[PDB]
Every structure is written in structure tokens, then in C-alpha cells.
Amino acid sequence: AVINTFDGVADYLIRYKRLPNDYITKSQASALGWVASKGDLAEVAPGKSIGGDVFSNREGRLPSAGSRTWREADINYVSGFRNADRLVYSSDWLIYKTTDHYATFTRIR
């Protein structure tokens, strides 16, 4: 029923091992008419947020382990241009948040 908060999404991921249904990847959003320069996601895909893309971790800012990969999701998105809030979650269920567009991270699960 639009789950887009840090706790809501984190607890959903832990329980169901997937993002809630209001999440679409960037390429899926594009297929629906999203253009980042227009800030139009809420108009072309009402109620949806960007999430599920691979998060590279190439800079090692998040902890690394053999066979661990990471994905990201937008948090608190309502409309217009994307914001600064993200959840980043690993394949072994570590969950980190950022509220400054990936400058700093805090573990929440």
C-alpha cells in the first residue's frame, strides 16, 4: 500500500526477500516513459519508486564478503526529481541507509 520508508522497506525485505511491488528498476521506469531530466516518475508511473538495481560497491564503502552482492532502493520518494535517501541491501540481508546521496551509510539491519 506504498511501502517506502526505511523501516517499512527493510522489514519487507527481511520477511519476503524482495522489494515491495511499488518498486521498479531504472530500465523498467524508462520503458514506462521516465526521463530523469524531466523529473516525471510520479506522472508516468504513479505510486512507483526506483529500486532494485545493482549497487556496485566498487569503492568498498560497504563491507565486502565472498559471494556478497548489493542492490539499492529509493526511500521517501513522492514526486519530482529523485531525492537523497536510499536503502542498500546485500544478498545476505545486511541493510544500510543513506540520507545524503551515498556520502555516508548507517547500518539498520
From Swiss-Prot:
For this record, the Gene Ontology CC terms, alphabetical, are: extracellular region
Q: Which UniProt keywords apply?
A: Endonuclease, Hydrolase, Nuclease, Secreted, Signal
What positions constitute the catalytic site?
A: 72, 101
* Highest rank taxon of the organism: Bacteria
Zinc-finger: present as a keyword of the record?
no
EC number from the UniProt entry = 3.1.27.-
Q: Which enzyme class, named as a word?
A: hydrolase
Give the family from UniProt.
Belongs to the ribonuclease N1/T1 family.
Q: What does this protein do?
A: This is a purine-specific ribonuclease.
Q: What is this protein called?
A: Ribonuclease
Lineage summary: Bacteria, Bacillati, Bacillota, Bacilli, Bacillales
Question: What range of the parent protein does this fragment cover?
Answer: 54 to 162 of 162
